[PDB]
Each structure stands twice: as structure tokens, then as C-alpha cells.
Design an enzyme around this catalytic site. Sequence first.
Site, PDB file in Angstrom:
ATOM      1  N   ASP A 157       3.545  -3.204 -37.058  1.00  0.00           N
ATOM      2  CA  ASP A 157       2.912  -1.889 -37.100  1.00  0.00           C
ATOM      3  C   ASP A 157       3.890  -0.900 -37.734  1.00  0.00           C
ATOM      4  O   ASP A 157       5.069  -0.862 -37.388  1.00  0.00           O
ATOM      5  CB  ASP A 157       2.564  -1.382 -35.689  1.00  0.00           C
ATOM      6  CG  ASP A 157       1.571  -2.272 -34.964  1.00  0.00           C
ATOM      7  OD1 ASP A 157       0.528  -2.615 -35.560  1.00  0.00           O
ATOM      8  OD2 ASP A 157       1.835  -2.614 -33.790  1.00  0.00           O
TER       9      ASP A 157
ATOM     10  N   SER B 237       9.286  -2.196 -27.594  1.00  0.00           N
ATOM     11  CA  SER B 237      10.161  -2.854 -26.637  1.00  0.00           C
ATOM     12  C   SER B 237      11.546  -3.096 -27.214  1.00  0.00           C
ATOM     13  O   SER B 237      12.518  -3.184 -26.469  1.00  0.00           O
ATOM     14  CB  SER B 237       9.552  -4.179 -26.183  1.00  0.00           C
ATOM     15  OG  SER B 237       9.456  -5.085 -27.267  1.00  0.00           O
TER      16      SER B 237
ATOM     17  N   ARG C 294       6.632 -15.109 -28.661  1.00  0.00           N
ATOM     18  CA  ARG C 294       7.459 -13.916 -28.507  1.00  0.00           C
ATOM     19  C   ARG C 294       8.458 -13.916 -29.662  1.00  0.00           C
ATOM     20  O   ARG C 294       8.651 -14.944 -30.315  1.00  0.00           O
ATOM     21  CB  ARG C 294       8.228 -13.971 -27.185  1.00  0.00           C
ATOM     22  CG  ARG C 294       7.365 -14.086 -25.937  1.00  0.00           C
ATOM     23  CD  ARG C 294       6.791 -12.752 -25.558  1.00  0.00           C
ATOM     24  NE  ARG C 294       7.848 -11.812 -25.208  1.00  0.00           N
ATOM     25  CZ  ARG C 294       7.645 -10.525 -24.968  1.00  0.00           C
ATOM     26  NH1 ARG C 294       6.420 -10.026 -25.036  1.00  0.00           N
ATOM     27  NH2 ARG C 294       8.666  -9.736 -24.673  1.00  0.00           N
TER      28      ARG C 294
ATOM     29  N   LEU D  63       3.237   1.918  -1.915  1.00  0.00           N
ATOM     30  CA  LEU D  63       3.506   2.312  -3.287  1.00  0.00           C
ATOM     31  C   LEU D  63       2.274   2.975  -3.876  1.00  0.00           C
ATOM     32  O   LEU D  63       1.147   2.564  -3.602  1.00  0.00           O
ATOM     33  CB  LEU D  63       3.881   1.093  -4.125  1.00  0.00           C
ATOM     34  CG  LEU D  63       5.021   0.225  -3.595  1.00  0.00           C
ATOM     35  CD1 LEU D  63       5.411  -0.792  -4.651  1.00  0.00           C
ATOM     36  CD2 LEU D  63       6.202   1.089  -3.242  1.00  0.00           C
TER      37      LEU D  63
ATOM     38  N   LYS E 193       0.811  -1.207   0.000  1.00  0.00           N
ATOM     39  CA  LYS E 193       0.000   0.000   0.000  1.00  0.00           C
ATOM     40  C   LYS E 193       0.850   1.264   0.000  1.00  0.00           C
ATOM     41  O   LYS E 193       0.378   2.330  -0.384  1.00  0.00           O
ATOM     42  CB  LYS E 193      -0.939   0.007   1.205  1.00  0.00           C
ATOM     43  CG  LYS E 193      -2.097   0.989   1.070  1.00  0.00           C
ATOM     44  CD  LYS E 193      -3.110   0.813   2.199  1.00  0.00           C
ATOM     45  CE  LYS E 193      -4.334   1.692   1.993  1.00  0.00           C
ATOM     46  NZ  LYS E 193      -3.973   3.135   1.876  1.00  0.00           N
TER      47      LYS E 193
ATOM     48  N   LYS F 276      -6.107  -8.153  -1.131  1.00  0.00           N
ATOM     49  CA  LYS F 276      -5.862  -9.253  -2.051  1.00  0.00           C
ATOM     50  C   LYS F 276      -4.428  -9.746  -1.945  1.00  0.00           C
ATOM     51  O   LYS F 276      -4.171 -10.942  -2.055  1.00  0.00           O
ATOM     52  CB  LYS F 276      -6.177  -8.824  -3.490  1.00  0.00           C
ATOM     53  CG  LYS F 276      -7.660  -8.548  -3.738  1.00  0.00           C
ATOM     54  CD  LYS F 276      -7.916  -8.094  -5.170  1.00  0.00           C
ATOM     55  CE  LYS F 276      -9.401  -8.021  -5.499  1.00  0.00           C
ATOM     56  NZ  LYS F 276     -10.167  -7.179  -4.541  1.00  0.00           N
TER      57      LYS F 276
ATOM     58  N   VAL G 227      -8.003 -13.315 -29.634  1.00  0.00           N
ATOM     59  CA  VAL G 227      -7.894 -13.303 -31.088  1.00  0.00           C
ATOM     60  C   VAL G 227      -7.801 -11.829 -31.477  1.00  0.00           C
ATOM     61  O   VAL G 227      -8.601 -11.014 -31.025  1.00  0.00           O
ATOM     62  CB  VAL G 227      -9.148 -13.888 -31.762  1.00  0.00           C
ATOM     63  CG1 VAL G 227      -9.017 -13.784 -33.264  1.00  0.00           C
ATOM     64  CG2 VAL G 227      -9.344 -15.323 -31.349  1.00  0.00           C
TER      65      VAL G 227
ATOM     66  N   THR H 284     -11.260 -12.967 -26.594  1.00  0.00           N
ATOM     67  CA  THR H 284     -10.601 -11.656 -26.669  1.00  0.00           C
ATOM     68  C   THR H 284      -9.120 -11.770 -27.013  1.00  0.00           C
ATOM     69  O   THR H 284      -8.459 -10.767 -27.246  1.00  0.00           O
ATOM     70  CB  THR H 284     -10.697 -10.872 -25.342  1.00  0.00           C
ATOM     71  OG1 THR H 284     -10.122 -11.651 -24.287  1.00  0.00           O
ATOM     72  CG2 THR H 284     -12.131 -10.552 -25.006  1.00  0.00           C
TER      73      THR H 284
ATOM     74  N   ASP I  75       5.990  -7.931 -30.842  1.00  0.00           N
ATOM     75  CA  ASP I  75       5.816  -7.590 -32.251  1.00  0.00           C
ATOM     76  C   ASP I  75       6.889  -6.600 -32.699  1.00  0.00           C
ATOM     77  O   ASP I  75       7.807  -6.278 -31.945  1.00  0.00           O
ATOM     78  CB  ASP I  75       4.425  -6.966 -32.494  1.00  0.00           C
ATOM     79  CG  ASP I  75       4.296  -5.548 -31.927  1.00  0.00           C
ATOM     80  OD1 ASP I  75       5.269  -5.048 -31.322  1.00  0.00           O
ATOM     81  OD2 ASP I  75       3.219  -4.923 -32.083  1.00  0.00           O
TER      82      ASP I  75
HETATM   83  N1  LIG Z   1      -0.063   6.827 -25.606  1.00  0.00           N
HETATM   84  C1  LIG Z   1      -0.137   5.494 -25.815  1.00  0.00           C
HETATM   85  N2  LIG Z   1       0.828   4.881 -26.479  1.00  0.00           N
HETATM   86  C2  LIG Z   1       0.569   3.571 -26.649  1.00  0.00           C
HETATM   87  C3  LIG Z   1      -0.525   2.845 -26.220  1.00  0.00           C
HETATM   88  N3  LIG Z   1      -0.422   1.520 -26.616  1.00  0.00           N
HETATM   89  C4  LIG Z   1       0.721   1.457 -27.246  1.00  0.00           C
HETATM   90  N4  LIG Z   1       1.385   2.661 -27.284  1.00  0.00           N
HETATM   91  C5  LIG Z   1       2.712   2.924 -27.837  1.00  0.00           C
HETATM   92  C6  LIG Z   1       3.838   2.600 -26.845  1.00  0.00           C
HETATM   93  C7  LIG Z   1       4.278   1.216 -27.284  1.00  0.00           C
HETATM   94  O1  LIG Z   1       5.642   0.956 -26.939  1.00  0.00           O
HETATM   95  C8  LIG Z   1       4.123   1.317 -28.792  1.00  0.00           C
HETATM   96  C9  LIG Z   1       4.068  -0.004 -29.524  1.00  0.00           C
HETATM   97  O2  LIG Z   1       2.929  -0.766 -29.117  1.00  0.00           O
HETATM   98  P1  LIG Z   1       3.093  -2.261 -28.583  1.00  0.00           P
HETATM   99  O3  LIG Z   1       1.743  -2.739 -28.181  1.00  0.00           O
HETATM  100  O4  LIG Z   1       3.836  -3.004 -29.639  1.00  0.00           O
HETATM  101  O5  LIG Z   1       3.934  -2.170 -27.333  1.00  0.00           O
HETATM  102  P2  LIG Z   1       5.361  -2.567 -27.101  1.00  0.00           P
HETATM  103  O6  LIG Z   1       5.898  -1.637 -26.076  1.00  0.00           O
HETATM  104  O7  LIG Z   1       6.112  -2.760 -28.370  1.00  0.00           O
HETATM  105  C10 LIG Z   1       5.332  -4.158 -26.110  1.00  0.00           C
HETATM  106  P3  LIG Z   1       5.557  -5.668 -27.193  1.00  0.00           P
HETATM  107  O8  LIG Z   1       4.886  -6.796 -26.493  1.00  0.00           O
HETATM  108  O9  LIG Z   1       5.107  -5.289 -28.565  1.00  0.00           O
HETATM  109  O10 LIG Z   1       7.020  -5.927 -27.217  1.00  0.00           O
HETATM  110  O11 LIG Z   1       2.905   2.068 -28.969  1.00  0.00           O
HETATM  111  C11 LIG Z   1      -1.532   3.500 -25.475  1.00  0.00           C
HETATM  112  O12 LIG Z   1      -2.555   3.017 -24.974  1.00  0.00           O
HETATM  113  N5  LIG Z   1      -1.254   4.854 -25.319  1.00  0.00           N
HETATM  114 MG   LIG Z   2       5.513  -3.824 -30.054  1.00  0.00          MG
HETATM  115 NA    NA Z   3      -8.443  -9.199 -29.138  1.00  0.00          NA
HETATM  116 NA    NA Z   4      -0.806   3.146  -1.934  1.00  0.00          NA
HETATM  117 NA    NA Z   5       2.800  -2.951 -32.019  1.00  0.00          NA
END
Ligand SMILES: Nc1nc2c(ncn2[C@H]2C[C@H](O)[C@@H](COP(=O)(O)OP(=O)(O)CP(=O)(O)O)O2)c(=O)[nH]1
Ligand SMILES: [Mg+2]
Ligand code: NA
Ligand code: NA
Ligand code: NA
EC number: 2.7.7.7
Length: 326
Positions: free
Chosen positions: A247, A171, A140, A53, A51, A63, A94, A92, A181
Site C-alpha cells: 500500500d 506494523s 507473513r 476489563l 469482565k 463464553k 481472497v 472472504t 504487508d
Molecule cells: N483509522 C483507521 N486506520 C486504519 C484502519 N485499517 C488500517 N488502518 C491504518 C492503521 C494500520 O497500521 C495501517 C496499515 O494497514 P494494515 O492493514 O497494513 O495494518 P498493519 O498495522 O500494517 C498490520 P499488518 O498485518 O499489515 O502487519 O492503516 C481502519 O479501519 N481505520
Molecule cells: Mg500493513
Molecule cells: Na477478502
Molecule cells: Na467489562
Molecule cells: Na496495508
Amino acid sequence: TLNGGITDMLTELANFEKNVSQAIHKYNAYRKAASVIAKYPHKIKSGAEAKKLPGVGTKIAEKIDEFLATGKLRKLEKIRQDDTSSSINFLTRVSGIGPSAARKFVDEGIKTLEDLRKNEDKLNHHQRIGLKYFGDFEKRIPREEMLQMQDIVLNEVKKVDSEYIATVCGSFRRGAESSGDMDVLLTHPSFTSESTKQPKLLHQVVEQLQKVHFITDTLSKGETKFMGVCQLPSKNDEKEYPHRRIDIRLIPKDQYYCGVLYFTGSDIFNKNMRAHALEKGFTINEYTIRPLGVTGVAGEPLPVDSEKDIFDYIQWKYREPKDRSE
DNA sequence: CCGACCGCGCATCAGC
DNA sequence: GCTGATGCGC
DNA sequence: GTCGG
Ligand SMILES: Nc1nc2c(ncn2[C@H]2C[C@H](O)[C@@H](COP(=O)(O)OP(=O)(O)CP(=O)(O)O)O2)c(=O)[nH]1
Ligand SMILES: [Mg+2]
Ligand code: NA
Ligand code: NA
Ligand code: NA
Ligand SMILES: [Cl-]
Ligand SMILES: [Cl-]
Ligand SMILES: [Cl-]
Ligand SMILES: [Cl-]
Ligand SMILES: [Cl-]
């Protein structure tokens, strides 16, 4: 992993609220808590300690006590036993099927992978591709493969027009050893916040990538955003690689830093940073950072020449990509 | 309390 | 056809 | 579900 039990639990609760409850805020509340705890450098010994944090309140505190005590959570055990919830959660997964569609399909008796396959007629294009590659999109991508994919994309884009600049974000840019991705930021001098001097800028690249059989499918496509599928080429006699989600985002050249900041993420990091921006009196999107006027209405774009300039504006010390993984 | 919770591209629908 | 609301996603 | 005014 230090507090893996607790964070997994919070994530399961988050996904449940999102997919089944369709309660986005509860979803984000659980995600944030999960994020804050994942970063906490100590093995949590009690809800109370948690808590402390920001993001962990009374409920999650309880929980966590239940979890640390029994190694499980009743709320989740029950949810796991509920058929509707389980069905909705599965569907969800898919790509293209969100909370609404999932609940509707379940209303029609379509609840399993088998049901989805015999009912393709009931799926739109995106959902159709999501099912086709349902298994692959669950895998992955090792960084080693991300590097081969990077090399193909940059070289292919370069062949189209030497002036295109393609930057792998997500990432991968944050240094991850594996990515869900591939995310590509694309810029071209002919496209600025000032003007679009050349049409089909994103199209040409997509076209060239499909031509070399890198891009295999298309979930959605527009003037600036491409959402599809790609696959590395495999050698003679070797099993071919899994299909991967890809993307591609075309951003005005002069708005690169706001664009790369955005695409580098993470998503949660972006949410926290944008929220913080507001508190400091600014608003940030993938194109610009603007101040919030007295009336709350956004002002004019502020000058930016680096990602750091954005951090400074909101009085945040610079954080390298690798440290933005929230 | 209680209101805020980031910001936006594309696909799809209903209403006109 | 258009505009706008909603879903889904990044 | 959590938080700050
Ligand atoms: N303001 C925002 N920005 C966003 C949002 N959702 C995604 N993003 C941005 C940030 C992500 O890194 C980037 C790519 O989107 P991705 O889903 O690929 O995320 P990765 O960080 O690459 C994790 P991985 O599992 O693909 O490795 O898009 C959002 O809600 N609000
Ligand atoms: Mg990504
Ligand atoms: Na989905
Ligand atoms: Na807190
Ligand atoms: Na992406
Ligand atoms: Cl909610
Ligand atoms: Cl559990
Ligand atoms: Cl910029
Ligand atoms: Cl803008
Ligand atoms: Cl870094």
C-alpha cells in the site's frame, strides 16, 4: 499468547460476525475484547476476572467460562460444522471478496478454491489478483525481508525525485518482527493541503517501481492511494520470494504527522484514539485534528508539528509506535 | 433503557 | 457523462 | 456485544 486460547476464540467470533453475520459492530466488539485481553498481563482464571476489563461484558464473560472449563466453545463448534458459514468464511479470505460477494458466490455454487479458479470470468480485477496470490498473501513477511523491501523503495523513489520522502509505516514502524504487508507513506513538497503543484506524483513512483519489477500487480490506483503487489528480486538459482501486498499513500507534506500517525496504526489503536478524541471534543483523520463545535460540526485544522501534539490535544500521554499495537 | 460504535480512498453500480 | 450509495479495503 | 449518559 498468555491468554491465546481466549483471544483466538474471540477473533473467530469476530470474523464470523463480520463475514457471515455482516454485523460490523459485533465484529468490533469481539476485536476490542480480544485486544484488551491480549494486553492483560495475567493468565485469566475466569470470566469474572475478564469482565473487569473494559470491552468484556456479560456475554464474553460467559463464553470465557465455557472456554476455560472445556477448552472449547459450542457456538463455534456449530459454526464450524455449518457449510454455508464455512464457505463464506473461506471465500472472504481472497483479497477483494468481502461478506457480500462471498455470500453471493456461495449462492451460485462457487464455494471452493477450485470453483474460484474455473470461474475467473466471474471475478473483478482485484479478486482476480487475490486468487492468483491466495497462498502468498497468507504468508507473513520477516522483518529482514521488510528491510530489503524498504531499501529498494526508498532508493527507487529517490531516483525519481530526490525530494520524495518515503516512510515505511504499519506494523513495521511499530517494530514488529514480521508484517502482513508493507505500508508506505509518501510525501512531496509539490503536494500540500495548499495545492497540487505537480501531477502524477504517485504515478511516477508506481511507474518506477514497476519498471524495476518490484511492483508486480495493481489492485487499485488513484491520485493518492495505491493498492497492489510487490516481490523482492531473488538471486541466481534461488527460489523466488513470495508476492507481497503493498500500500502506498500520498499525503500532503504539511500534514505528515497526522498522516504517519494514521498509517502507523494499529487499526484498533486508531479507532480507540479517534473515539477518545471525540469524547474530548476533537475529530481526527489522516490529514488533521479539528475541534468539534457546539453544533457538532468540525472546526478548522489545529496546528500540528509532531505526533505528540496530537496526543496532547486529546490529553493522552505520548505512546511510542511500538506501544500502539492494539 | 438505548443510542453510539473512526474516518476515508478507490471501484463499481444504479439512476439520471 | 454526473452524483451518490454500497462494497471493500487501509 | 458493550458501554455511558
Ligand atoms: N483509522 C483507521 N486506520 C486504519 C484502519 N485499517 C488500517 N488502518 C491504518 C492503521 C494500520 O497500521 C495501517 C496499515 O494497514 P494494515 O492493514 O497494513 O495494518 P498493519 O498495522 O500494517 C498490520 P499488518 O498485518 O499489515 O502487519 O492503516 C481502519 O479501519 N481505520
Ligand atoms: Mg500493513
Ligand atoms: Na477478502
Ligand atoms: Na467489562
Ligand atoms: Na496495508
Ligand atoms: Cl452489529
Ligand atoms: Cl472453540
Ligand atoms: Cl499534521
Ligand atoms: Cl481534514
Ligand atoms: Cl517505537
